[PDB]
Amino acid sequence: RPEPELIRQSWRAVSRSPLEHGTVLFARLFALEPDLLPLFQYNCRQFSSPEDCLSSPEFLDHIRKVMLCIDAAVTNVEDLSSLEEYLASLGRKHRAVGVKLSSFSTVGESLLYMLEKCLGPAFTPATRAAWSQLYGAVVQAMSRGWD
């Protein structure tokens, strides 16, 4: 159970510009794991240009979906069991498109980077710990989807 106010007050800041913050998360994620980008080519409907896929409405829509999912976790920070079935279904969908479960740990590192970029020293160790616990719960629920 992550401290709710630390999660809510930090998420509120990133919610002011969710697409811009999501782009920052993905930029770190791709630098840490370059193999992830070719998975998005199918949604883009073209395999010739990674850069065109990165700037595509289809890629932006995925960023919007990711921010909505994190928003649902933040809304349910007090009880994440409500989203257990949905997160397992999300885990199934990612396994279906070739995503490895290990890449979700890399997404967690990118999320902390996005938050530190947005908040600076306001991203306190307690805030970082709260986000680590919340994200760890989200990936533990999504992990059951892989089975």
The span from the CA of 138 to the CA of 39, in Å, is 21
62 is in an annotated binding site: yes
Using CB under 6 A as the binding rule, whether residue 101 contacts ligand HEM is answered as no
17 with 103: CB under 8 angstroms?
no
What is the total count of residues that contact ligand HEM (CB under 6 A)? 15
The span from the CA of 17 to the CA of 25, in Å, is 13
| 33 phi/psi in degrees, rounded to 5 | -135, 85
CB of 35 to ligand HEM, least distance (A): 9
Q: Which 12-71 residues touch ligand HEM, going by CB under 6 A?
A: 36, 39-40, 43, 62, 65-66, 69
CB of 58 to ligand HEM, least distance (A): 9
Task: Give the footprint of ligand HEM on this chain (CB under 6 A).
Answer: 36, 39-40, 43, 62, 65-66, 69, 90, 93-94, 97, 99, 103, 107
